[PDB]
Design an enzyme around this catalytic site. Structure first.
Site, short mmCIF file in Angstrom:
data_model
loop_
_atom_site.label_atom_id
_atom_site.label_comp_id
_atom_site.label_asym_id
_atom_site.label_seq_id
_atom_site.Cartn_x
_atom_site.Cartn_y
_atom_site.Cartn_z
N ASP A 35 33.02 36.91 41.15
CA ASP A 35 32.21 38.04 40.71
C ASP A 35 30.80 37.56 40.40
OD1 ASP A 35 31.11 40.32 39.62
OD2 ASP A 35 32.40 40.35 37.85
N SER A 199 15.21 45.52 47.59
CA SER A 199 15.30 45.90 48.99
C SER A 199 14.05 46.66 49.40
CB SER A 199 16.54 46.75 49.24
OG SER A 199 16.55 47.25 50.57
N1 LIG Z 1 30.66 42.97 38.95
C1 LIG Z 1 30.38 42.83 37.54
C2 LIG Z 1 29.46 43.96 37.07
C3 LIG Z 1 30.00 45.19 36.72
C4 LIG Z 1 29.16 46.21 36.29
C5 LIG Z 1 27.79 45.99 36.22
C6 LIG Z 1 26.86 47.10 35.75
F1 LIG Z 1 27.54 48.29 35.67
F2 LIG Z 1 26.36 46.78 34.52
F3 LIG Z 1 25.83 47.22 36.64
C7 LIG Z 1 27.26 44.76 36.56
C8 LIG Z 1 28.10 43.75 36.99
N1 LIG Z 2 33.20 44.20 38.30
C1 LIG Z 2 34.18 43.28 37.75
C2 LIG Z 2 35.56 43.90 37.92
C3 LIG Z 2 36.36 43.54 39.00
C4 LIG Z 2 37.61 44.11 39.16
C5 LIG Z 2 38.06 45.04 38.24
C6 LIG Z 2 39.44 45.67 38.41
F1 LIG Z 2 39.61 46.03 39.72
F2 LIG Z 2 40.41 44.77 38.07
F3 LIG Z 2 39.54 46.77 37.61
C7 LIG Z 2 37.27 45.41 37.16
C8 LIG Z 2 36.02 44.84 37.01
#
Ligand SMILES: NCc1ccc(C(F)(F)F)cc1
Ligand SMILES: NCc1ccc(C(F)(F)F)cc1
Length: 330
Positions: A35, A199
């Protein structure tokens, strides 16, 4: 040194991607969601509330000869989708595709939200954003990438996500056989702790390219593409029968429609997302209404270049002192 590991979609919609990670001595192999939108390495463990575990592989620190409890350290995280988890912290050896880091913070989940429990294929998350976002208290911890940076041949990692197919995460080197043409590099802002870039515009199908600055984050941990309302309305206006549904919570379209491609700008270069990538299937089993892969970011507060966009490109996360993002066609 370098590392290379295969990443695999968790289901037929490419909702997430899991990558095998070795933790502990002897190795305990867990499948983690890499992530780049977060900065915590947390795992299901022997400490997780038993009712909140449903099919996941758990990390057992008591069976690792290299595991050390980080005394007094706790962690608690909340993701933009409302998911959350919390627990305590260990240090242990962590290896990804042959690349090993000793003394990595491994955050053991004591409590996880329901959406994690229901995802039996994801044993945890490996955060690859910048360490300033790590939630470990009172002593913030570094990410896997930050700990490996010094020993990497090059302080980079690349994301090559597959469309309904396996892909690759590489640490320390650029595979010049994995992309076509040239890599276009663009400037990154770290002020929010994200891989945040701008972008240069977009196009819908074969339409005219619209030069306009779209500020967003490269997030492998987010399934869909989230863009400003003006852009998303322009896209879905080209799909007959498409409409925004408040009950479903986004744009839906008739499953019989054909979706146009979506192009986004990286400098003077263009990344084209095939329309098939934007199809996320029926909103419910048997339904003829299908959920779109391009949704509005109005409610989020930030534009997110998630898997839908990233899997259309070879993506370089350059962690040099001045970090940059590289995009190539593949
Ligand atoms: N994949 C992690 C993640 C999930 C949500 C956000 C948000 F909503 F804050 F943009 C950033 C990063
Ligand atoms: N953005 C991070 C994240 C990744 C996967 C999930 C899930 F699928 F497990 F709910 C939640 C949050």
């Amino acid at each position: 040194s370098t590392g290379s590991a295969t990443t695999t979609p968790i289901d037929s919609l490419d909702d997430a991607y899991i990558t095998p990670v070795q933790i502990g001595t002897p190795a305990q192999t867990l499948n983690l969601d890499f992530d780049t939108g977060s900065s915590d390495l947390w795992v299901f463990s022997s400490e997780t509330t038993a009712s909140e575990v449903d099919g996941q592989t758990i990390y057992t620190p008591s069976k690792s000869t290299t595991a050390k409890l980080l005394s007094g350290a706790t962690w608690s995280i909340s993701y933009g989708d409302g998911s959350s988890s919390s627990g305590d912290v260990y240090t242990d050896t962590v290896s990804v595709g042959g690349l090993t880091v000793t003394g990595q913070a491994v955050e053991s989940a004591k409590k996880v939200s329901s959406s994690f429990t229901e995802d039996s294929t994801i044993d945890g998350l490996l955060g690859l954003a910048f360490s300033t976002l790590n939630t470990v208290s009172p002593t913030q911890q570094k990410t896997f990438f930050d700990n490996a940076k010094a020993s990497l041949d090059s302080p980079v990692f690349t994301a090559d996500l597959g469309y309904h197919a396996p892909g690759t995460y590489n640490f320390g080197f650029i595979d010049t056989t994995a992309y076509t043409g040239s890599i276009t590099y663009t400037a990154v802002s770290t002020k929010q702790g994200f891989w945040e870039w701008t972008s240069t515009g977009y196009a819908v199908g074969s339409g005219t390219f619209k030069s306009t600055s779209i500020d967003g984050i490269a997030d492998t941990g987010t399934t869909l593409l989230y863009l400003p309302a003006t852009v998303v309305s322009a896209y879905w206006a080209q799909v007959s029968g498409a409409k925004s549904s408040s009950s479903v919570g986004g744009y839906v379209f008739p499953c019989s429609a054909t979706l146009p491609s979506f192009t986004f700008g990286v400098g003077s270069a263009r990344i084209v997302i095939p329309g098939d990538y934007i199809d996320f299937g029926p909103i419910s089993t048997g339904s003829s209404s299908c959920f779109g892969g391009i949704q509005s970011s109005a409610g989020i507060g930030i534009n997110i270049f998630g898997d839908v966009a990233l899997k259309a490109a070879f993506v370089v996360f350059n962690g040099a002192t001045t970090p940059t993002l590289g995009f190539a066609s593949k």
